[PDB]
């Protein structure tokens, strides 16, 4: 049985401009005291066509973790648009939240992210190269995809 | 890059009586000749409240597997109702198809399965203990949940 169980993720400040940081409130239960910290990450999928465009937006080591219910408000800066392929910028992509214990990833929470223009002129006639200052990020918060992995909890 | 890629799963003989064997047509691509067998499994989740009620309906080792496109119908007998908790028999449960290579699971295809009576009298006044001979299994085939895991292929 996993010593840490994620019970909820709330997506905050959504929708928002593309350039605003990501904000998530995570609720988890620790079944027993952990001897090491939990490593939380926010990973942006710059391209669904290649994992080479993944951007680790933030990585944070939080602990010591005692037994009981915990809550974590995790903020990460927006991705670097200079690394995103233009064809993936407007439309749906993915953002991931992962948690790692002793080098082993035990959970990955994924969301679809819809990045679109809000001005009518831009929606109908999008610029040749995406204008990230005009894109609105809409995380599809009601549909998280939760994947859990078996790890050695000691 | 994964040496085996599952491209499609078609659920056959669906809906059907609960007691009919499961039949799934799987299409996969082998990027290169495998030196070891692939291990395919069909696992029935007897209870969403506890993994102790999982039933491995079929577990098979197949190979050698040459490079190229492959297609096969994977059949497994229906689960043993004597192991299913009564409270989980009528309503939604899960059936899984997994593939493993060198002891490592690399893919899981899950389906929600809705087990219900078809007679009006039974739907409105279900028997105290489920009657599996009167249950119709309806696999929710248009919504497969595909999860891939990174493994060491060699």
């Amino acid at each position: 049985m996993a010593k840490v169980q994620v019970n909820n993720v709330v997506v905050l400040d959504n929708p928002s401009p593309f350039y605003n940081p990501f904000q998530f409130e995570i609720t988890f239960e620790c079944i027993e005291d952990l001897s090491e910290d939990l490593e939380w990450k926010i990973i942006y999928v710059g391209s669904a066509e290649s994992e080479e465009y993944d951007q680790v937006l933030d990585s944070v080591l939080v602990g010591p973790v005692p037994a009981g219910r915990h809550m974590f408000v995790f903020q990460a800066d927006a991705p670097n648009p200079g690394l995103i392929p233009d064809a993936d910028a407007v439309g749906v992509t993915v953002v991931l939240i992962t948690c790692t214990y002793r080098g082993q990833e035990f959970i990955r929470v994924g969301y679809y992210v819809n990045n679109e223009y809000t001005e009518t002129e831009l929606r109908e006639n999008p610029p040749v190269k995406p204008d990230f200052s005009k894109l609105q990020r809409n995380i599809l918060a009601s549909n998280p995809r939760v994947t859990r992995f078996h790890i050695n909890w000691e | 890059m994964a040496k085996v890629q599952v491209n499609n799963v078609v659920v056959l003989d669906n809906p059907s009586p609960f007691y009919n064997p499961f039949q799934f047509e799987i299409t996969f691509e082998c990027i290169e000749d495998l030196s070891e067998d692939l291990e395919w499994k069909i696992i029935y989740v007897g209870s969403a409240e506890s993994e102790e009620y999982d039933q491995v309906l079929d577990s098979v080792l197949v190979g050698p597997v040459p490079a190229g496109r492959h297609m096969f119908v994977f059949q497994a007998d229906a689960p043993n109702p004597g192991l299913i908790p009564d409270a989980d028999a009528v309503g939604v449960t899960v059936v899984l198809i997994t593939c493993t290579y060198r002891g490592q699971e690399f893919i899981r295809v899950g389906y929600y399965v809705n087990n219900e009576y078809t007679e009006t009298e039974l739907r409105e006044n279900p028997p105290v203990k489920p009657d599996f001979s009167k249950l119709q299994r309806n696999i929710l085939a248009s919504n497969p949940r595909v999860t891939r895991f990174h493994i060491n292929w060699e």
Binding site: E49, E51, V94, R145 | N7, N8, P144, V146, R148
Partner: peptide
């Protein structure tokens, strides 16, 4: 597709 990498999430 349900069978393509729109399952990186």
């Amino acid at each position: 597709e349900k069978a393509a990498x729109x399952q990186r999430i």
